Amino acid sequence: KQVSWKLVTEYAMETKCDDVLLLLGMYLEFQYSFEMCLKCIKKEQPSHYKYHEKHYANAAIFADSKNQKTICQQAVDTVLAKKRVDSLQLTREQMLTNRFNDLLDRMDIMFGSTGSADIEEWMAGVAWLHCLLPKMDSVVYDFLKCMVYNIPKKRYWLFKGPIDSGKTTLAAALLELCGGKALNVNLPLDRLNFELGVAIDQFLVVFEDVKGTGGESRDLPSGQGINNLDNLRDYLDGSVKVNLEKKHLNKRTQIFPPGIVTMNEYSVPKTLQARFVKQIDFRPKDYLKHCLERSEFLLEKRIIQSGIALLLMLIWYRPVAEFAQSIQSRIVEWKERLDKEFSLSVYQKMKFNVAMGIGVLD
Amino acid sequence: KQVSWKLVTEYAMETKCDDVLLLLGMYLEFQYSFEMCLKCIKKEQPSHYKYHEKHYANAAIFADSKNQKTICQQAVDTVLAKKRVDSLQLTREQMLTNRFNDLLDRMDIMFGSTGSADIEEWMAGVAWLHCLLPKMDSVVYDFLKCMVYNIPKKRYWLFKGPIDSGKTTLAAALLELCGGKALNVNLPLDRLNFELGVAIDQFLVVFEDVKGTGGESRDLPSGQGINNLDNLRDYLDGSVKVNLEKKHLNKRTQIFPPGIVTMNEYSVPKTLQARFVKQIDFRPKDYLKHCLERSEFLLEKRIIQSGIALLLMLIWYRPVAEFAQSIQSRIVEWKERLDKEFSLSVYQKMKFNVAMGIGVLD
Amino acid sequence: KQVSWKLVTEYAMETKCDDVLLLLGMYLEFQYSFEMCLKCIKKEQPSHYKYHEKHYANAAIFADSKNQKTICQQAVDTVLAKKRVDSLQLTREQMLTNRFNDLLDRMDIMFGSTGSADIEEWMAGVAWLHCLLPKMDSVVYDFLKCMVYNIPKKRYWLFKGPIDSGKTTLAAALLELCGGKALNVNLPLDRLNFELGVAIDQFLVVFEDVKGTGGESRDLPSGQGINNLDNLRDYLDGSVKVNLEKKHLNKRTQIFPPGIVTMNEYSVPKTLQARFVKQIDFRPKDYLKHCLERSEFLLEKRIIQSGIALLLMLIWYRPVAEFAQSIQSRIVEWKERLDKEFSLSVYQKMKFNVAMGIGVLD
Amino acid sequence: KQVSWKLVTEYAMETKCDDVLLLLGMYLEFQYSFEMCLKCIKKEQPSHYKYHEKHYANAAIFADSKNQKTICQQAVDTVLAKKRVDSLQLTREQMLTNRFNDLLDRMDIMFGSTGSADIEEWMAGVAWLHCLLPKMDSVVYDFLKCMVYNIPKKRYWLFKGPIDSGKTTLAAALLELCGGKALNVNLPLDRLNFELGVAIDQFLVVFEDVKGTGGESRDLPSGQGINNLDNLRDYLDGSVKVNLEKKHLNKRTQIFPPGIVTMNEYSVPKTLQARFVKQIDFRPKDYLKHCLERSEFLLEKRIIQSGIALLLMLIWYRPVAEFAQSIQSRIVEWKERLDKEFSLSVYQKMKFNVAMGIGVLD
Amino acid sequence: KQVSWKLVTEYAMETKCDDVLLLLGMYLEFQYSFEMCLKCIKKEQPSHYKYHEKHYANAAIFADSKNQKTICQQAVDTVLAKKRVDSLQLTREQMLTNRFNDLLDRMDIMFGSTGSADIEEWMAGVAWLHCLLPKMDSVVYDFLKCMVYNIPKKRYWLFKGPIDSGKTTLAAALLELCGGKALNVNLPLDRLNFELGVAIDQFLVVFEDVKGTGGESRDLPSGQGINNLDNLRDYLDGSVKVNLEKKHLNKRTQIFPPGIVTMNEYSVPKTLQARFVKQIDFRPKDYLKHCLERSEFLLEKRIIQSGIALLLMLIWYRPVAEFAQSIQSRIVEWKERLDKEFSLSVYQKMKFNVAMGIGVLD
DNA sequence: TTTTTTTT
Ligand SMILES: Nc1ncnc2c1ncn2[C@@H]1O[C@H](COP(=O)(O)OP(=O)(O)OP(=O)(O)O)[C@@H](O)[C@H]1O
Ligand SMILES: Nc1ncnc2c1ncn2[C@@H]1O[C@H](COP(=O)(O)OP(=O)(O)OP(=O)(O)O)[C@@H](O)[C@H]1O
Ligand SMILES: Nc1ncnc2c1ncn2[C@@H]1O[C@H](COP(=O)(O)OP(=O)(O)OP(=O)(O)O)[C@@H](O)[C@H]1O
Ligand SMILES: Nc1ncnc2c1ncn2[C@@H]1O[C@H](COP(=O)(O)OP(=O)(O)OP(=O)(O)O)[C@@H](O)[C@H]1O
Ligand SMILES: Nc1ncnc2c1ncn2[C@@H]1O[C@H](COP(=O)(O)OP(=O)(O)OP(=O)(O)O)[C@@H](O)[C@H]1O
């Protein structure tokens, strides 16, 4: 009798497992009997307890195999291959619906009976976020449509403002919402070539806190970032396929994703200024600070950074009509759940608290 | 029974597939029964639904194999081999004749019954491009000849002028038409060797927005691009075969392809100026912007960036006899279909709208 | 008859052997009869004498294999895979609990009947460490809580004071207790990239001797480190993931670990001062100096460096309920053993000796 | 019939051979008739003539093998694994006995009847070394003990004196005795970090001819050695582990070995002076110079630089109990040989001769 | 039947082929019928005609093997292993013996029945060489002996003399006789250091003309040479091992090989002067150059810098006893030939023609 | 082994 490589590939597929070592370690856990498996019985990880009993017999035979790493290598390549197929064949809209399905699936667990997310704490986060900029939910919707359309040379948004104005905070949540990567371009030009490699097949990117020069007039430290970006002008325009590489990999050629740039108030060359479709100014506000001091469970649990928070904001504010047709059904059920939990006065009480700079809860 | 490596190889030829992961991913989809395959029934992409039913039998047994990446590698090698044989033995006119047939096949689908595109929106785009320069269709025909003849040291066209003059736009559609690559040479020299490795067996190349020096007087940020290019005179001249890199691969020796350079107008040292047979100077023209602004679907469907649009322009403007003889049969049908669909009065009406800067339609 | 790869993997798991050559060498030693084995009889190394009798039969066949290094590689992969699974799934409390179990095992040997270590000398160490700072045991307990909760911004501690004031001693003991790595950020700004690479998957980090500037007024050597630090606030605040690089490896994205900063008396920018929950002032007290002169076995055996010494300090001082609930049983057993061998008056006599600056033992 | 890989592995172990080509070459020699073998009959090389008979049958069958390098590679791995195990498990005192046994084996050859060397010429070297410092043999014994104990802080010895005063000579001999490496820290502070990587797993290090500053007033060339060194106190004290680089390869952590520092009479900061256990300083002496000038076979045979000479000196002067138990039997036999070979009056003549600065032999 | 790998390995040993491709090519030539092999019949190349008939049948089967390069790789390892063995066991005297034995083999066929050269051309070579300075045969024999012993400090000779004074010409020829390299030191300190690893395993080394600092006091253009050498002391003296490095590579330890310095007439500090056994001085010479101008077959066939010309010069001047004791037979055999083919009068006529500066032949 | 890193 022999290992079924097919069953391992199925496990890799259904867990979306990218890493060969993680896959290996996970699969080997199944060799003990599920019947007593404490990880199953304590329901500790779904990517274990859902699968252990199914995969058990093949795991025992796999445990004896002499090829174990080769089998995992084949499985992981299949997961990688499916991503590459999807990168070419899906519409950008349909990609976003898949991503939303996955966040909505994680939310199903978080706010379940199992798991521990207090939906009231998370809704308090939405209140604080909705304060950070005027018409916040409209701003998020405009960004999402811009990311779907990916209109050439209208692909990038610039966040400006003083330090501690929440710009990277807001960038973090958007990145989780869409999926994508942060990049640091203040590097030297040689390392920069490998830095850009991580963009491959990603949907969205964020350039974190690029440095200009001469901002030492406001005591901004100087650095290369702005000048490096103005060399990469082509990559922002997104009109033509560009060549990207990773350590020991031959290049791949694709259109470089859309995204966000964040900075303090250095001056921007006109060449680069013309690449941004929109700029947003962030400013420090005392009531947010005073509220947040009295509300630190927000930060302790990282609610304010997380794409889950933005998704809850959208579900609150936007019509069902604005979602794609497949997910509209789940959207209606979540809208139903939220309204049952929170009346508007309860939500307004929160927003009123934040504006008053008391702790969000009274 | 056992996997036919032959049938896998045949599919790779049919699809003209280079990436082993893209090949692997798509071939695996055929493992499920085509009898109900939703991708077939929704007729989503032809590279699937044409082939699924034929390959299903072999795709099933492939899904069980332990060699999968090895089989895909050999198939990918066969596709790459075909490209290298063609690269040596065909006339440049034959290569382009084959290239046109591929685009025309895509146009059969785009305006077919599946008909996802609208021929009117696409023809509106043609009017917009022909308005971009004097005698546009003549300039296109000149460029094709120059690339086909490939006269040594008379091989390169320089596009120049300010931001948003459109030079990238025009370059993009040409690159699609002829099937080249873009390259970025503003990086430092020690990275550059592997970048140029991309140009192996390519028909055409474009170097994008190569940064110069001294134009800082006009606030053009300085860079290395011009210095890098002037180190590479030989590659422009195409006078003698030169060596090209790939990671983990030994050098390939061949003549470096012809093509196009874009700049916002830094100064060009005369060693480098001597190597351009022609230069075209682009100008911002506000009424185009106003037309675009009221014609959003052009950019959103990326119409004006497509060689498909340029092919439609040539079919509208040029004599049948000017095309390579084998295609002329297809040209006649496309000319007929165009005349059937568009009255010249409609095309005149459109071009008037473009000139007026109203939205193209009325 | 065949080799059992399973038994090798089991030995590698049990020994947690990370290195293929270390694994290979030790396994081959078992091929001689354990019944006569000199290393067994001298009870020299636990990873041998516990295991020789069990694996002897398989080691005899392993000695004839032609595959030997291939067997070992698969085994080492299994141990590495287990670490990555743990890294992604354990709670930080679980991690720390495991680490303590390791130290408790090493203590059972050191103070075992075979053990070389005189528990009295190690208690003298704890008396000296407890004199280093007021409320020393409470201070340690606070630090551990802070590491396990890993609350954003509330993450970093500052050790400050003159040369030869013990800060590196305490840092090393804490780093041993928790596991982690030292980092040097006085480097020029480019090399920092690979330097930060070592933090990958670590529980804890320490920044040595960050050199300020302008402390040359106080004859302090000036250097870059302080400026390098405030340029990394996103790493310290731990609120958002960062990208980390190792030589020859693709980046991984994670929350940067919590840690400790150590310095002599440079001035600190207020922006940087805000990052730290606690600053601890170390000052030289020459009665400790005169004590070490007359208690040198502390230094010679490195007792005052050891996490083992801090663990004994916790066991002696803290209530049982404070320990991770599972291992509380082992803690009680160690408390009982300590109570048996050291009456409070014995320990307090030692502490009084240290206070007098005289030799600890009398 | 089959090659025994086991017999090759034995030969590699018995010869301590760890270059795959060196092993491969020598094993192939055994294919020819042992009975006839000229090398055996010349008794020329022990690693041959001790072995050729034993291995002859297996070497013949190995000569037909289609697989030869794989066998040698596995054998080499066995020898490297043995070193790896030993490096982590042995006591420092056992390492020294191992190192001593090796030298004693080579002396059995050199002064055996087959040996080319003259024990009287080597004994002349011992006398010249003994005159280089008062109580030379006690100095050497103290130094060795210090390295074996490796007591923290009490780890480093300083050699001072004019050029051509022998400090390099003695350091080289000690380093040949114990094993270790030299280092140069006159470098700038960037290159330094790769330079220290040399020390990994070494038993000793030596710092060669560090340059101070302002020694130019004594014509001593200035340099950064001392300033670099005074910043490394944590490496010297040996009280905690440190991180060590290598080019390309990844970082490593260990205690920095004990060692020796050598210089001309620059000043030293008191901060650095406190690092040293023992300042030894060298005068040039004319009679040593004149004696060398009349006994140049010493230099020509490189006797006075050799660790063999130091071992001979220890045997001549030290009590047997000062040697570790295992070697004491060989020590007794060598003492007895030496007593038989030199009556004390011979040695007294040699010493008194050197005191007259005439050539050692008369 | 099947390929004998053994026969291939014998041929590689007998022909001392280092290169896998060269081996493969030549062995394939044997596949055609030896019984009428036209290359054999033309007696073109001993490496073929001496072996074809013997290897014929095996070469036929070799041509049908599917595995050919694998056979050749193992055979090439056998030859490289033989070098690695000898490189670590022979005396320098034996090494030179082999080196001469090789050149005498070349000499045997060079003027064999193929008549492929005329000795008189080389006698004119020898004649011109002996004119270069006094007693040139003795200078060779002495320098040769000097390098064979490699006695410490007594290791370096200095070649003074202007541009185009022949010092380079001489050393290049003498390196053919011995084997070794030339090196440069007129270097910035990085490059100075990274040259040094080239010396690894060199039997002998040379310095290319050292452009000593401030030679422009003599109008000699200069760089770092002098003080670099004066500070690189011990490398000259060869007293103790030194560790040597080249770019990216690791260091390795040996005694630094002996050698010679070429210099134009720069300044020397007596410190650096003291490092040398001999000063020699050079010039272009006017009869000699007018002879070269008239004797150009010497330069055309490279005779005047062949080591073969030095070998012949020794065989002419030096008695048989001065040569390696087994090789002395061949010395007699070649003395016979030259003493037969040339009277001393024809040698005197040639030498007299050099003395007149007239074309050596008359 | 190349590559990446070292080297620059
Ligand atoms: N608009 C704001 N007004 C006041 N406090 C703010 C504001 N935004 C953020 N904060 C506080 O400042 C902290 C840092 O926020 P954040 O990191 O997003 O700032 P940033 O200016 O965007 O930073 P950086 O430029 O370094 O990425 C937050 O955790 C919160 O405590
Ligand atoms: N001639 C033009 N007049 C007005 N608008 C133009 C013109 N050409 C292009 N545009 C607008 O400018 C946008 C960018 O065009 P494009 O990138 O081709 O210009 P470019 O001159 O090559 O710029 P750059 O050098 O900055 O990349 C187009 O998408 C279109 O909206
Ligand atoms: N409080 C103290 N009073 C006096 N001596 C002390 C005190 N603490 C430490 N020592 C002495 O200082 C020596 C060095 O300690 P340690 O390495 O921790 O100092 P440090 O100030 O943290 O040094 P560095 O900043 O150089 O790493 C100890 O071995 C001990 O001899
Ligand atoms: N005590 C001495 N008196 C006189 N000459 C000496 C003495 N010791 C060594 N020599 C001579 O000095 C030569 C060099 O010795 P060595 O390299 O050990 O000296 P050093 O003091 O370490 O020199 P440097 O500082 O130049 O490296 C020896 O080979 C010997 O010829
Ligand atoms: N004594 C000589 N008589 C005639 N020609 C000579 C003599 N010396 C050198 N030349 C000519 O000059 C050429 C260059 O010689 P070589 O390079 O050996 O000289 P060099 O002194 O080392 O030169 P440089 O110092 O300029 O590098 C010789 O090959 C020869 O053609």
Gap from CA of C282 to ligand 3 centroid (Å): 9
State how far the Cα of E272 lies from the Cα of E236, in Å rounded to an integer. 10
Q: Is the CB of C201 under 7 A from strand F?
A: no
Helix (H) or strand (E) run with residue B63 in it:
helix B52-64
Q: Which two tokens stand for residue E23?
A: 């081996």
Q: Considering only alpha carbons, which residue of chain D is nearest residue C195?
A: D251
Q: Which two tokens stand for residue A194?
A: 């490998």
- Using a CB–CB cutoff of 8 Å, tell me whether D247 touches chain E: yes
Q: Contact at 8 Å (CB) between A288 and A355?
A: no
Q: Name residue D182's beta-bridge partners.
A: D206
Q: Is the CB of D250 under 7 A from strand F?
A: no
Q: Is the CB of A42 under 7 A from strand F?
A: no
Greatest CA separation found in chain C? 76
Q: Is the CB of D190 under 7 A from strand F?
A: yes
Long-range CB contact pairs, C224-228, < 8 A, 24+? C224/C185, C224/C186, C224/C187, C224/C188, C224/C189, C225/C185, C225/C186, C226/C266, C226/C268, C226/C269, C226/C272, C227/A221, C228/C185, C228/C186, C228/C187, C228/C189, C228/C192
DSSP E240-252: S-EEE--TTSPPE
> Which residue bears the tokens 């802080």?
D153
Measured CA A247 to C1' F3 distance, in angstroms = 8
Asked if B247 and A243 come within 8 Å (Cβ–Cβ), the reply is no
Helix (H) or strand (E) run with residue D284 in it:
none
Ligand nearest to the CA of A153: 2
State how far the Cα of B108 lies from the Cα of B99, in Å rounded to an integer. 15
Q: How far is C299 from chain A (nearest CA, A)?
A: 41
Q: Considering only alpha carbons, which residue of chain A is nearest residue B218?
A: A270
| Binding site membership of E208 for ligand 5 (Cβ less than 6 Å) | no
CA D114 to chain centre: 24
Asked if B264 and A250 come within 8 Å (Cβ–Cβ), the reply is no
**Amino acid, single-letter form, for residue A194:** F
What angle separates helix A68-89 from helix B20-29, to the nearest 10 degrees?
Answer: 90
Residue C130 annotated in ligand binding: no
Measured CA A81 to C1' F8 distance, in angstroms = 39
Q: Name residue E278's beta-bridge partners.
A: E157
Protein residue closest via CA to atom 16 of ligand 3: C166
Chain B, 166-185: which have a CB under 8 Å from a chain A CB? 168-169, 171-172, 175, 181-184
Q: Contact at 8 Å (CB) between C359 and C294?
A: yes
The length of chain E, given as a count of residues: 362
To test the ligand 1 pocket, which listed residue (A129, A159, A169, A304) has its Cβ within 8 A of the most ligand atoms? A169
State how far the Cα of B138 lies from the Cα of B144, in Å rounded to an integer. 10
- Using a CB–CB cutoff of 8 Å, tell me whether D84 touches chain C: yes
CA B138 to chain centre: 19
- Using a CB–CB cutoff of 8 Å, tell me whether E85 touches chain D: yes
Nearest one of D122, D9, D110, D2 to D65, comparing CA atoms: D2
Q: Which residues of E209-233 are buried (b: 16+ CB within 10 A; e: fewer)?
A: bbbbbebeeeebebbbbbbbbbebb
Q: Contact at 8 Å (CB) between E13 and E78?
A: yes
The answer to whether chain D touches chain E by having 3 or more C-beta pairs less than 8 angstroms apart is yes
| Binding site membership of D166 for ligand 4 (Cβ less than 6 Å) | yes
3-state secondary structure of D256: coil
3-state secondary structure of B218: helix
State how far the Cα of A171 lies from the Cα of A182, in Å rounded to an integer. 9
Computed on alpha carbons and rounded to an integer, the radius of gyration of chain C in Å comes to 23
Name the residue with the least CA to C1' distance from nucleotide F5: D248
Q: Which two tokens stand for residue E299?
A: 């330069």
Give ∠ CA A203-A208-A210 in degrees, rounded to 5: 130
- Using a CB–CB cutoff of 8 Å, tell me whether D152 touches chain C: yes
State how far the Cα of C137 lies from the Cα of C142, in Å rounded to an integer. 9
Q: How far is C191 from chain D (nearest CA, A)?
A: 10
Q: Name residue B278's beta-bridge partners.
A: B157
State how far the Cα of B80 lies from the Cα of B20, in Å rounded to an integer. 11
Q: Structure resolution in Å?
A: 3.0
Q: Which two tokens stand for residue D241?
A: 């582990």
DSSP C235-259: HHH-SS-EEEEETTEEEEEEPPPPE
State how far the Cα of E41 lies from the Cα of D149, in Å rounded to an integer. 76
Q: How many CB pairs under 8 A join A and B?
A: 105
- Which subunits count as partners of chain A given 3+ CB pairs below 8 Å? B, C
State how far the Cα of E156 lies from the Cα of D221, in Å rounded to an integer. 25
3-state secondary structure of D357: coil
Instruction: Count CB-CB contacts under 10 A for residue B58.
Output: 22
DSSP A166-194: SHHHHHHHHHHHH--EEE---S-HHHHHH
Residue C109 annotated in ligand binding: no
Protein residue closest via CA to atom 3 of ligand 3: C284
Instruction: Count CB-CB contacts under 10 A for residue E284.
Output: 13
DSSP E208-277: ----BTTGGGGT---BSHHHHHHHSHHHHHT-S-EEE--TTSPPEEEPPPPEEEEE-S----HHHHTT-S
Q: Which residues of chain D neighbour E152 with C-beta distances below 8 Å? A: 299-300, 302
CA A319 to chain centre: 23
Asked if D21 and E80 come within 8 Å (Cβ–Cβ), the reply is yes
Q: How far is C179 from chain A (nearest CA, A)?
A: 22
- Using a CB–CB cutoff of 8 Å, tell me whether A193 touches chain B: yes
- Using a CB–CB cutoff of 8 Å, tell me whether A2 touches chain B: no
Q: Is the CB of D247 under 7 A from strand F?
A: yes
> Which residue bears the tokens 């037909």?
D64
Q: Contact at 8 Å (CB) between D3 and D65?
A: yes
- Which subunits count as partners of chain D given 3+ CB pairs below 8 Å? C, E
State how far the Cα of D194 lies from the Cα of D252, in Å rounded to an integer. 12
**Strand F bases contacted by the protein (CB, 7 Å):** 1-8
Backbone angles phi, psi at C212, to 5 degrees: -80, -165
| Binding site membership of E356 for ligand 5 (Cβ less than 6 Å) | no
Q: Name residue C263's beta-bridge partners.
A: C160
Q: How far is B177 from chain A (nearest CA, A)?
A: 13
State how far the Cα of E235 lies from the Cα of E240, in Å rounded to an integer. 8
Q: Considering only alpha carbons, which residue of chain B is nearest residue A78?
A: B25
In the annotated binding site of D, the residues are 37, 40, 48, 52, 161-168
Among all strands, which nt has the closest C1' to B191 (CA)? F4
Ligand nearest to the CA of B167: 2
Nearest one of E212, E238, E239, E216 to E224, comparing CA atoms: E212
Pairing verdict, β B249-254 and B242-246: antiparallel
Q: Is the CB of B250 under 7 A from strand F?
A: no
State how far the Cα of C52 lies from the Cα of C35, in Å rounded to an integer. 9
3-state secondary structure of D182: strand
Name the residue with the least CA to C1' distance from nucleotide F6: E248
Q: Name residue E262's beta-bridge partners.
A: E159
- Using a CB–CB cutoff of 8 Å, tell me whether D250 touches chain C: yes
